[PDB]
Structures are given as structure tokens and as C-alpha cells.
Amino acid sequence: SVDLIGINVAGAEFTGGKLPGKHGTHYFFPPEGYFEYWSEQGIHTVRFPLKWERLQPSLNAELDDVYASLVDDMLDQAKENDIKVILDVHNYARYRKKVIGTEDVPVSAYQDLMERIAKRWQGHDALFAYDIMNEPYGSADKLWPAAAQAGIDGVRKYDKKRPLLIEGASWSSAARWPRYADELLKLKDPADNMVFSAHVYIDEDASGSYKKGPGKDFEPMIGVKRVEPFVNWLKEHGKKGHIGEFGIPNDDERWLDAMDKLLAYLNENCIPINYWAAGPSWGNYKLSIEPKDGEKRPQVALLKKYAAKDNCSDFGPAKAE
């Protein structure tokens, strides 16, 4: 089943400056009882960021025992708690700051990573899908479509069933999607289970930093307006979609109204969303929906209303008929 409502659970990718880094100091996996809270809230799909450099300290070599085992543990806990997990290689189309497709990081090395990820986890019941790369951007954009095919090829050697979530150029911007996405039309998935995943924030620069409030001229449909270019492209090209990140601060009711409008539009078009973000070690982060003393998380109540609505049969938008 494809859940329309889901959340990111971030932390395993934190403190990119420290490699390998230390669990519990630089990065954080869900502790005991973590998924039970979210399951009880009625959330059954999670997107989980992972750091490539921690999974694979050397290219074209075996996955790191300790970090990969933490992923094993997380998947086990998700399964215990009725949660389905999208593994996200949260790397901006780069390995140790070098773009996939450059001499340092050949596409074959990225294919190798994806082979190893699918080989290790394809047998895990909690695994739902693979988001093969978070937010290609900048000098990675031009080479990304070639890298994406290599990633698809890698997963499909070992997992011929699960959805592949394919992000786009320019931080997978939903708003700018059609400017660049035609380059993705050459991608092929022999299993026919490929889904494009765009990101949308509704601050002025769409970075999610929220440097300003809604403003005097706030438009409630801002979220919808920013995903329309993506969804319309999907319809035009007969493709399937997904929103892998969207988040808002908890300090202005207007953001919630925009979120509501967005959720309605995505629901209508059978496009699932992963809210950014929950996680075990966010502290005061403005977009966090993790429970924290003294903080209300109105975004959660809203997600819960939607979570009750029927899911679609598959990733939308529905084919024309």
C-alpha cells in the first residue's frame, strides 16, 4: 500500500563534517520506543536520510558494519511498529564533495552503492522504497540524469519489485521542475516502478530556512502553486510523483492554512508527501514535528486529519482515461 501521508525521520545524516563520526554525538538513529509514538499517531510511512560516506567509507567496497547495522536496527524497529521505510541516500549527488560522474566518483561507484543497499535490505519487510539521491544541485545537475540511471540499474540488480524515487536537478525543486526535468525522460526502469520525488518549501527562496514570516501579501495557495509545475509535468508525460520534503514553522497559523491547501491538492492527485521533519535529535529546529517540551506541533494534527483519508492504489497522478 502507498500511504499519502508520511514523515521524514532525520538524524543519521547529521554533522557531515565528522566522518565516520560517532553515533550519539554527531549523528542519531531512533532510540527504543521512537517509532511507537509515530505509529500511535497514525503515521505509517517514514523517509529516512542516510549519509553515503558513513555507509561506504571507501567507494566500491563493503558497507560499513557499524553504520549499516544501525540501519538494520532501525528497520527492525520500524517493522515492530507497523512503519514502512523509504531509505534516502542524502547526498546531493556528491561523495566527499565530488559530483557523481567526475573522475573521483564514477557512475559505476554510485551503481555499486545502490547495488549494496538493495542487496542488504531487499529482504527487510519494513523497507518500502529507495529514494536514490537527495537534492542534486549546482555542478551536479548536468551529470545527474546519467547518475540516476546508474542508481536505478544498481537497485534493480537485487530488488525488482520496490518503487524507486528519483529526485530532480536544482534541489529537486517542484516549482522549477519543468525547467530541467525533460532530461529525466530518458530514464528507464525495467520494473516500471519509478516515481519522481520533488521538494517544496514555502518561504520566499524555497530553501526552508524561513527567513521571513508569511508577510502582508501572503497567498494561501502558495504551496499548491509551487507544486503545480511538477504535477502538471507528470500528467503531461504520463509519470508518477511524490513530495519527499515539505515543512513549515509552528509560529504562524497562515503557514498551516497553506499546508492544508497543499495536502488537499496532493490528495486529489494521489501524490504522497513526507513532512520534513521528525527525528530523535532536532532540538529547537523550527520545522521539527518531534515532540518537545513547550512546543505545539499543529502540523501533526493536520497530517493526522489527512492520514485518515483513503490512500490511492498507486502513486499518482492517475492516468488520463
Ligand SMILES: OC[C@H]1O[C@@H](O[C@H]2[C@H](O)[C@@H](O)[C@H](O)O[C@@H]2CO)[C@H](O)[C@@H](O)[C@@H]1O
Ligand atoms: O529546497 C531545500 C534546499 O534549498 C536550498 O536552497 C536553494 C533553494 O532551494 C532555491 O530555491 C534557491 O533559489 O537557491 C537556494 C540556494 O542558494 C538549500 O541550500 C538546501 O540546503 C535545501 O535543502
